[PDB]
Amino acid sequence: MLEVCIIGFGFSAIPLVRELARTQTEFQIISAESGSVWDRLSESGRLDFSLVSSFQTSFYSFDLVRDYEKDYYPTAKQFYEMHERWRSVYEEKIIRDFVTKIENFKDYSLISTRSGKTYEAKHVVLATGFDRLMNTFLSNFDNHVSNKTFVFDTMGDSANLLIAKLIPNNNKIILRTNGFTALDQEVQVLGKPFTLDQLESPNFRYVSSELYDRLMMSPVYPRTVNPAVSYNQFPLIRRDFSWVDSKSSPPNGLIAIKYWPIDQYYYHFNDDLENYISKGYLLNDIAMWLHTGKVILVPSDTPINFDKKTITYAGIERSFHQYVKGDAEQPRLPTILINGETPFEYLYRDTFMGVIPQRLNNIYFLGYTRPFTGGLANITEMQSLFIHKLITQPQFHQKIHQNLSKRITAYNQHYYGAAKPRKHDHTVPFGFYTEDIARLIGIHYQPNECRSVRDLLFYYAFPNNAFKYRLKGEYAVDGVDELIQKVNDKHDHYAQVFVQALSIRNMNSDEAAEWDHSARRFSFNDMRHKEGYRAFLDTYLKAYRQVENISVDDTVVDEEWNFMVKEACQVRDKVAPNIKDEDVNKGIRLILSILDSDISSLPDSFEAQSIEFIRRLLQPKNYELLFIR
Numbered sequence: 001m002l003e004v005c006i007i008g009f010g011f012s013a014i015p016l017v018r019e020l021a022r023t024q025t026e027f028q029i030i031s032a033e034s035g036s037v038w039d040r041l042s043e044s045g046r047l048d049f050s051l052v053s054s055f056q057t058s059f060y061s062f063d064l065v066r067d068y069e070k071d072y073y074p075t076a077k078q079f080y081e082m083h084e085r086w087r088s089v090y091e092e093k094i095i096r097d098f099v100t101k102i103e104n105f106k107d108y109s110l111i112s113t114r115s116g117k118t119y120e121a122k123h124v125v126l127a128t129g130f131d132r133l134m135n136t137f138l139s140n141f142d143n144h145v146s147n148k149t150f151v152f153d154t155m156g157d158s159a160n161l162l163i164a165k166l167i168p169n170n171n172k173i174i175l176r177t178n179g180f181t182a183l184d185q186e187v188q189v190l191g192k193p194f195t196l197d198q199l200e201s202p203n204f205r206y207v208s209s210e211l212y213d214r215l216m217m218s219p220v221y222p223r224t225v226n227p228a229v230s231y232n233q234f235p236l237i238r239r240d241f242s243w244v245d246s247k248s249s250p251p252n253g254l255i256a257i258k259y260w261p262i263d264q265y266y267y268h269f270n271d272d273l274e275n276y277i278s279k280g281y282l283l284n285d286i287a288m289w290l291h292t293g294k295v296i297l298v299p300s301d302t303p304i305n306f307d308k309k310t311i312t313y314a315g316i317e318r319s320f321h322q323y324v325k326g327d328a329e330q331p332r333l334p335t336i337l338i339n340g341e342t343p344f345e346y347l348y349r350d351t352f353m354g355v356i357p358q359r360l361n362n363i364y365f366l367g368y369t370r371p372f373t374g375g376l377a378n379i380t381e382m383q384s385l386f387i388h389k390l391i392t393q394p395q396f397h398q399k400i401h402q403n404l405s406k407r408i409t410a411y412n413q414h415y416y417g418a419a420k421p422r423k424h425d426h427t428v429p430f431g432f433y434t435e436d437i438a439r440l441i442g443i444h445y446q447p448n449e450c451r452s453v454r455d456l457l458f459y460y461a462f463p464n465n466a467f468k469y470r471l472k473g474e475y476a477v478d479g480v481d482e483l484i485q486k487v488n489d490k491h492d493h494y495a496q497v498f499v500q501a502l503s504i505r506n507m508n509s510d511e512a513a514e515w516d517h518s519a520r521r522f523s524f525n526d527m528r529h530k531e532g533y534r535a536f537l538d539t540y541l542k543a544y545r546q547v548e549n550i551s552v553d554d555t556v557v558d559e560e561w562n563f564m565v566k567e568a569c570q571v572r573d574k575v576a577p578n579i580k581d582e583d584v585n586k587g588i589r590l591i592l593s594i595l596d597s598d599i600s601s602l603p604d605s606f607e608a609q610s611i612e613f614i615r616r617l618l619q620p621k622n623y624e625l626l627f628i629r
């Protein structure tokens with residue numbers, strides 16, 4: 001009887017197939033001849049964009065140990081070439097067919113296909129990805145559209161990419177939405193670049209809920225009155241967060257757009273602009289678009305007539321070329337029959353860690369958990385290790401399954417509380433999820449085993465990327481030692497991140513929010529760093545058009561759009577006229593000077609009490625996770 005069948009092979013399945021091959025576990029992969037959206041994009045020459053996630057969070061540990069030299073954002077082309085490279089390695093183990101049905105019995109499943117061939121396997125892993133409405137827009141995208149109006153009812157990474165492609169042809173963009181959370185994908189920390197996922201120091205949640213909340217939530221919740229922040233200049237960007245019923249911040253189910261702020265875009269790409277655009281580095285600064293009026297926010301009930309395809313805003317009845325409805329995603333699951341009769345109903349919250357479904361035997365889901373920030377790789381690498389351990393170690397399988405229902409209840413209580421299920425329940429903070437899996441598997445670090453301040457930097461401030469947990473022990477990957485050293489030397493051992501948490505231990509959330517926005521350039525949505533890049537933007541639009549062979553006439557002027565922009569930007573025209581690093585810098589020198597100091601022996605009695613707090617980091621009081629114990 002076949003031990004393992006993996007259904008679907010694109011990106012998510014790669015690390016699981018790697019571990020099954022290593023333990024010489026019998027497996028067969030079944031995956032559709034048609035492949036994925038990435039194959040649609042490759043075939044039509046539309047791999048002309050870049051990831052919204054860093055190299056370190058987006059490629060697997062076993063590629064990073066070879067290929068990491070510096071932080072960067074991979075291209076779509078690079079992401080696809082990496083899928084194809086691993087597909088080539090495993091192609092002989094892939095049956096090209098499409099699974100229509102799975103009948104699940106007490107200790108095996110019967111797998112049915114479009115060809116008619118059936119398969120029996122003891123363990124079945126689904127790695128089939130999602131159907132996304134928006135994929136048609138991207139794969140079938142027409143660029144010879146110019147001077148048209150588009151209306152979006154949802155703001156997401158897919159909408160933000162479409163918008164980046166539309167604005168250069170003087171398409172006007174209306175967002176008729178209930179607000180959105182957009183975050184600079186890159187931040188300058190004393191003039192030195194950090195991806196946003198590098199600043200999250202998630203294991204500080206173990207110090208306290210309250211402290212981590214103050215550390216993370218001021219750019220998401222409207223907590224500062226600072227008139228430089230986008231959510232003060234453009235309040236239609238704010239969201240109803242009245243659904244949140246968890247002390248875990250940021251909450252499971254929060255989604256965010258990650259985008260290039262134009263100042264970082266300029267820093268990376270100004271010196272070879274057309275070449276970088278041709279590679280797929282596209283400026284997607286939603287905050288610059290709002291600043292310049294290339295995008296407008298309108299209330300979610302602005303008059304729209306779908307029959308005449310007009311939207312009416314102030315006193316102009318605006319013709320629109322296209323309404324883009326919000327991007328629903330659902331797992332591509334075949335029919336699953338419980339005891340080979342009763343349709344399984346999929347619900348993220350009713351699975352353990354998004355991986356283990358109830359009422360099914362030896363079926364696992366891989367790739368259906370979405371990271372709040374950073375790449376999918378962090379999530380699917382840790383899921384793969386979890387699945388591999390459940391499949392290959394009956395002792396582990398027993399330990400997790402014996403109380404599966406109670407684990408799932410305890411997880412939902414911690415992360416969702418009383419909130420009713422939401423379509424984005426599958427979205428998790430990456431650094432909580434990787435750590436959660438690591439503790440379930442036993443490849444976690446123990447904060448009490450930190451000896452030096454350097455060890456505390458590693459435990460609390462070094463990002464919880466999947467490769468962090470592959471340095472030693474059961475799932476060690478050769479070269480992770482050298483990789484962690486390179487990362488640490490490039491980022492000063494994450495001392496700046498560690499110092500951030502120190503600086504706010506004593507503040508309330510309002511003080512922390514003001515303090516967070518007290519910099520010359522704060523991390524996220526700083527509207528003071530837009531006007532200075534208006535000339536660079538015209539250089540950019542010219543370079544984009546050259547790359548794409550488009551002529552558009554800027555000397556033709558859309559007078560009715562100019563009028564709608566005025567109305568949309570009334571709060572900005574009032575708020576904007578009203579427009580940390582000291583401390584942080586002295587914090588870093590203190591910490592970098594006690595790097596090799598023993599923690600437990602640090603003396604009693606800013607500089608004095610920050611030492612005591614550092615000593616307490618050996619015994620965090622909010623460590624318990626009841627879904628694991």
Ligand SMILES: Cc1cc2nc3c(=O)[nH]c(=O)nc-3n(C[C@H](O)[C@H](O)[C@H](O)COP(=O)(O)OP(=O)(O)OC[C@H]3O[C@@H](n4cnc5c(N)ncnc54)[C@H](O)[C@@H]3O)c2cc1C
Nearest residue numbers: 008010011012031032035051052098099128129367375376
């Ligand atoms: C436009 C776009 C941009 C993205 N940008 C990023 C980014 O910046 N960073 C990032 O980390 N992630 C990003 N992602 C998300 C994620 O990395 C991709 O969606 C990735 O393709 C997910 O891999 P997967 O293996 O889960 O699914 P896929 O890559 O979709 O592979 C699944 C495979 O299973 C096959 N299959 C499905 N159903 C069956 C069946 N019943 N029988 C047999 N075969 C089946 C499919 O044909 C397919 O080949 C992006 C996604 C999209 C669409």
